[PDB]
Design an enzyme around this catalytic site. Structure first.
Site, PDB file in Angstrom:
ATOM      1  N   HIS A   1      -9.169  24.741  45.580  1.00  0.00           N
ATOM      2  CA  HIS A   1     -10.211  24.521  46.577  1.00  0.00           C
ATOM      3  C   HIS A   1      -9.586  23.759  47.746  1.00  0.00           C
ATOM      4  O   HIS A   1     -10.144  23.723  48.845  1.00  0.00           O
ATOM      5  CB  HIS A   1     -11.333  23.660  46.000  1.00  0.00           C
ATOM      6  CG  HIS A   1     -12.247  24.390  45.069  1.00  0.00           C
ATOM      7  ND1 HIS A   1     -12.914  25.541  45.432  1.00  0.00           N
ATOM      8  CD2 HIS A   1     -12.632  24.115  43.801  1.00  0.00           C
ATOM      9  CE1 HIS A   1     -13.673  25.939  44.428  1.00  0.00           C
ATOM     10  NE2 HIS A   1     -13.521  25.092  43.427  1.00  0.00           N
TER      11      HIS A   1
ATOM     12  N   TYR B   1     -16.298  25.355  31.592  1.00  0.00           N
ATOM     13  CA  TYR B   1     -15.002  26.022  31.624  1.00  0.00           C
ATOM     14  C   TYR B   1     -14.538  26.334  30.199  1.00  0.00           C
ATOM     15  O   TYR B   1     -14.792  25.563  29.274  1.00  0.00           O
ATOM     16  CB  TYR B   1     -13.959  25.135  32.314  1.00  0.00           C
ATOM     17  CG  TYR B   1     -14.218  24.926  33.785  1.00  0.00           C
ATOM     18  CD1 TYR B   1     -14.077  25.976  34.692  1.00  0.00           C
ATOM     19  CD2 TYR B   1     -14.615  23.679  34.270  1.00  0.00           C
ATOM     20  CE1 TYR B   1     -14.328  25.792  36.046  1.00  0.00           C
ATOM     21  CE2 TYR B   1     -14.869  23.486  35.624  1.00  0.00           C
ATOM     22  CZ  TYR B   1     -14.726  24.551  36.506  1.00  0.00           C
ATOM     23  OH  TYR B   1     -15.015  24.387  37.840  1.00  0.00           O
TER      24      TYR B   1
ATOM     25  N   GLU C   1     -11.556  31.463  35.055  1.00  0.00           N
ATOM     26  CA  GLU C   1     -10.891  30.316  35.647  1.00  0.00           C
ATOM     27  C   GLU C   1     -10.986  29.113  34.719  1.00  0.00           C
ATOM     28  O   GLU C   1     -11.987  28.906  34.028  1.00  0.00           O
ATOM     29  CB  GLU C   1     -11.480  29.992  37.015  1.00  0.00           C
ATOM     30  CG  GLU C   1     -12.931  29.606  36.992  1.00  0.00           C
ATOM     31  CD  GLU C   1     -13.395  29.078  38.324  1.00  0.00           C
ATOM     32  OE1 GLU C   1     -13.019  27.940  38.669  1.00  0.00           O
ATOM     33  OE2 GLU C   1     -14.139  29.790  39.025  1.00  0.00           O
TER      34      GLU C   1
ATOM     35  N   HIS D   1     -14.850  29.906  32.556  1.00  0.00           N
ATOM     36  CA  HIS D   1     -15.952  30.779  32.933  1.00  0.00           C
ATOM     37  C   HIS D   1     -15.456  31.924  33.810  1.00  0.00           C
ATOM     38  O   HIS D   1     -14.338  31.894  34.331  1.00  0.00           O
ATOM     39  CB  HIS D   1     -17.126  30.006  33.579  1.00  0.00           C
ATOM     40  CG  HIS D   1     -16.880  29.560  34.990  1.00  0.00           C
ATOM     41  ND1 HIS D   1     -16.868  28.231  35.356  1.00  0.00           N
ATOM     42  CD2 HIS D   1     -16.661  30.263  36.125  1.00  0.00           C
ATOM     43  CE1 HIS D   1     -16.649  28.136  36.654  1.00  0.00           C
ATOM     44  NE2 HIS D   1     -16.518  29.355  37.145  1.00  0.00           N
TER      45      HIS D   1
ATOM     46  N   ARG E   1      -7.062  25.564  39.665  1.00  0.00           N
ATOM     47  CA  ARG E   1      -7.432  26.441  38.551  1.00  0.00           C
ATOM     48  C   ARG E   1      -6.363  27.475  38.233  1.00  0.00           C
ATOM     49  O   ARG E   1      -5.638  27.931  39.115  1.00  0.00           O
ATOM     50  CB  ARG E   1      -8.684  27.271  38.908  1.00  0.00           C
ATOM     51  CG  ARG E   1      -9.883  26.524  39.450  1.00  0.00           C
ATOM     52  CD  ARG E   1     -10.608  25.748  38.364  1.00  0.00           C
ATOM     53  NE  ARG E   1     -11.777  25.068  38.907  1.00  0.00           N
ATOM     54  CZ  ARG E   1     -11.771  23.816  39.357  1.00  0.00           C
ATOM     55  NH1 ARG E   1     -10.660  23.096  39.311  1.00  0.00           N
ATOM     56  NH2 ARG E   1     -12.858  23.303  39.916  1.00  0.00           N
TER      57      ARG E   1
ATOM     58  N   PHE F   1     -11.712  29.385  47.630  1.00  0.00           N
ATOM     59  CA  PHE F   1     -10.385  29.160  47.064  1.00  0.00           C
ATOM     60  C   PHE F   1      -9.328  29.797  47.952  1.00  0.00           C
ATOM     61  O   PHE F   1      -9.612  30.705  48.734  1.00  0.00           O
ATOM     62  CB  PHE F   1     -10.231  29.838  45.693  1.00  0.00           C
ATOM     63  CG  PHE F   1     -10.921  29.142  44.563  1.00  0.00           C
ATOM     64  CD1 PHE F   1     -10.346  28.034  43.952  1.00  0.00           C
ATOM     65  CD2 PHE F   1     -12.112  29.647  44.048  1.00  0.00           C
ATOM     66  CE1 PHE F   1     -10.934  27.443  42.847  1.00  0.00           C
ATOM     67  CE2 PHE F   1     -12.709  29.059  42.939  1.00  0.00           C
ATOM     68  CZ  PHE F   1     -12.114  27.953  42.338  1.00  0.00           C
TER      69      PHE F   1
HETATM   70  N1  LIG Z   1     -15.173  30.703  45.363  1.00  0.00           N
HETATM   71  C1  LIG Z   1     -15.527  31.266  44.171  1.00  0.00           C
HETATM   72  N2  LIG Z   1     -16.362  30.657  43.318  1.00  0.00           N
HETATM   73  C2  LIG Z   1     -16.532  31.373  42.174  1.00  0.00           C
HETATM   74  C3  LIG Z   1     -15.956  32.566  41.863  1.00  0.00           C
HETATM   75  N3  LIG Z   1     -16.376  32.996  40.634  1.00  0.00           N
HETATM   76  C4  LIG Z   1     -17.220  32.124  40.180  1.00  0.00           C
HETATM   77  N4  LIG Z   1     -17.367  31.108  41.080  1.00  0.00           N
HETATM   78  C5  LIG Z   1     -18.402  30.039  40.964  1.00  0.00           C
HETATM   79  O1  LIG Z   1     -19.464  30.344  41.902  1.00  0.00           O
HETATM   80  C6  LIG Z   1     -19.998  29.096  42.418  1.00  0.00           C
HETATM   81  C7  LIG Z   1     -19.886  29.047  43.970  1.00  0.00           C
HETATM   82  O2  LIG Z   1     -18.522  29.162  44.383  1.00  0.00           O
HETATM   83  C8  LIG Z   1     -19.192  27.958  41.796  1.00  0.00           C
HETATM   84  O3  LIG Z   1     -20.056  27.453  40.776  1.00  0.00           O
HETATM   85  C9  LIG Z   1     -17.903  28.679  41.312  1.00  0.00           C
HETATM   86  O4  LIG Z   1     -17.379  28.073  40.112  1.00  0.00           O
HETATM   87  P1  LIG Z   1     -16.300  26.892  40.185  1.00  0.00           P
HETATM   88  O5  LIG Z   1     -16.870  26.019  41.240  1.00  0.00           O
HETATM   89  O6  LIG Z   1     -16.261  26.374  38.810  1.00  0.00           O
HETATM   90  O7  LIG Z   1     -15.036  27.531  40.573  1.00  0.00           O
HETATM   91  C10 LIG Z   1     -15.110  33.177  42.797  1.00  0.00           C
HETATM   92  O8  LIG Z   1     -14.563  34.261  42.654  1.00  0.00           O
HETATM   93  N5  LIG Z   1     -14.928  32.444  43.947  1.00  0.00           N
END
Ligand SMILES: Nc1nc2c(ncn2[C@@H]2O[C@H](CO)[C@@H](O)[C@H]2OP(=O)(O)O)c(=O)[nH]1
Ligand SMILES: [Ca+2]
EC number: 4.6.1.24
Length: 104
Positions: A92, A38, A58, A40, A77, A100
């Site tokens: 989450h 992060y 995020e 990212h 986030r 999300f």
């Molecule tokens: N749900 C979700 N996950 C995201 C998105 N963009 C990046 N991710 C990342 O894609 C993977 C599957 O969801 C996770 O590693 C998540 O990171 P984070 O878990 O750090 O949020 C997004 O728009 N939605």
């Protein structure tokens, strides 16, 4: 009252602003913290209608009030863009798998 409610977590505008400032600074510097790297890119698979333009990033916002510096990021986030504009606060909590939902 809460400006943002993520499940059971309560956040004010100051909480989000503080977290955002931290996330943006790391973004500018090209540095990341934590095992999930992060801040990212946030792809917005959910398709949230953010008022500000992409790309989005995020960064965790913590219920403890402290700024994320590694370790467990929790479920919340703050989402910001390239112009350091807040897109929204997401979680989450209450979402299946790693999806999300917006904090109300
Ligand atoms: N749900 C979700 N996950 C995201 C998105 N963009 C990046 N991710 C990342 O894609 C993977 C599957 O969801 C996770 O590693 C998540 O990171 P984070 O878990 O750090 O949020 C997004 O728009 N939605
Ligand atoms: Ca607070």
């Amino acid at each position: 009252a809460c400006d943002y409610t993520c499940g059971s977590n309560c956040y004010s505008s100051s909480d989000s602003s503080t977290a955002q400032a931290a996330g943006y600074k790391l973004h500018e510097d090209g540095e990341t913290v934590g095992s999930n790297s992060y801040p990212h890119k946030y792809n917005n698979y959910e398709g949230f209608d953010f008022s500000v333009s992409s790309p989005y990033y995020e960064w965790p916002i913590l219920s403890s009030g402290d700024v994320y510096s590694g370790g467990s990021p929790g479920a919340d986030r703050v989402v910001f863009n390239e112009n350091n504009q807040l897109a929204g606060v997401i979680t989450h909590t209450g979402a299946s798998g790693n999806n999300f939902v917006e904090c109300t």
